[PDB]
Design a protein around this ligand. Sequence first.
Ligand code: NAG
Ligand code: NAG
Ligand code: NAG
Lengths: 12, 185, 182
Amino acid sequence: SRGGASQYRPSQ
Amino acid sequence: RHFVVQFQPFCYFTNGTQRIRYVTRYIYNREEYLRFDSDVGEYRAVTELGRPDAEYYNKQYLERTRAELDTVCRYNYEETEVPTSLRRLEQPNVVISLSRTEALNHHNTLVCSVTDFYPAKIKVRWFRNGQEETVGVSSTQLIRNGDWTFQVLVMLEMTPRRGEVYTCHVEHPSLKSPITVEWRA
Amino acid sequence: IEADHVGSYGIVVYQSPGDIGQYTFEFDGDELFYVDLDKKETIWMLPEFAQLRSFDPQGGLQNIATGKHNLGVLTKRSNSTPATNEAPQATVFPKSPVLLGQPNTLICFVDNIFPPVINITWLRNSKSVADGVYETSFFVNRDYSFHKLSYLTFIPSDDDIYDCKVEHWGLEEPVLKHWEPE
Ligand SMILES: *[C@@H]1O[C@H](CO)[C@@H](O)[C@H](O)[C@H]1NC(C)=O
Ligand SMILES: *[C@@H]1O[C@H](CO)[C@@H](O)[C@H](O)[C@H]1NC(C)=O
Ligand SMILES: *[C@H]1O[C@H](CO)[C@@H](O)[C@H](O)[C@H]1NC(C)=O
């Protein structure tokens, strides 16, 4: 049902 | 002056959800520097700007990233695309026109305009009095209208002559039976 | 890279100055939606798709916040290297064959856009047109530049001239791609 996004990961 | 970052995630599908290749790019201005490739199953640096992040991402969320290849990619495909993008059908409109004003032996050019279809898969063929023209045919590359429809123009070099019938033949997944549009001298 | 399909679920672009960000979902090169950051709303290109699927705009805001975080963190790590401007490329063409009196749409394709900030407008008979205009978000390219499209609905007539006006830092003078019913 609910689409999912690809987490944009934060650096240091 | 201006500075930018870009995060471009790609779920590459092949034969349904079989050969799924989940990738994830990290960009600065117009240059990539970090990447998660399902094929390598791990992060790697593409340019200097990435060395400082490598080990960090692998330690912080690799278990989470690999996980998305199924909670994002595979899931979206089988859960959201299947009933939307992969189901969407738009029948092409097929019209024939002549580049120059009609005449009886002057060489002109028939143009078969095939528009507003989706998906991109299409086949267009020209026929003269019933047989496949295999000489002066040419066509534009498939054009993407940016609104979820495509168009393509297929030209035929010719010379109008009475009694002659030219047909533009078109097959598309949206079509139960092919489309044929005739044009006569 | 070859494939039968390609889905980009969560493209983030974050620029400065301006805190200018875009969040989009693409599938096979077409735009599923972009999230309106000011309205906190997922705007679908094909409204009917929203009946069979969804996306919490929260996702966009979060990922954009990361874009904010990574820009700068990356800007310094690069000794503040500025983005080199590119010169856009515009081409105009109609959605379907032109027939006098039959509503149609002019498409202005603008490629090689970098950075992702630009002005695309339409001129009818050399005078400004605001009504019947629509445009897409910035699509990603292979060379990491962008392309975008603007649409003008119009009624074909014998004596009519249209231009697509594009403005970019990359251009010294605003490019005008002119078009008329041939
Ligand atoms: C996958 O799709 C490609 C392109 O349609 C095709 O060549 C191949 O036979 C299909 N099957 C495989 C190998 O997964
Ligand atoms: C973009 O073009 C329009 C066309 O009239 C202009 O009014 C505007 O000032 C330009 N850029 C912006 C939004 O400042
Ligand atoms: C920029 O200068 C800093 C200062 O030492 C250096 O550490 C860094 O590697 C340089 N990066 C680039 C290529 O701008």
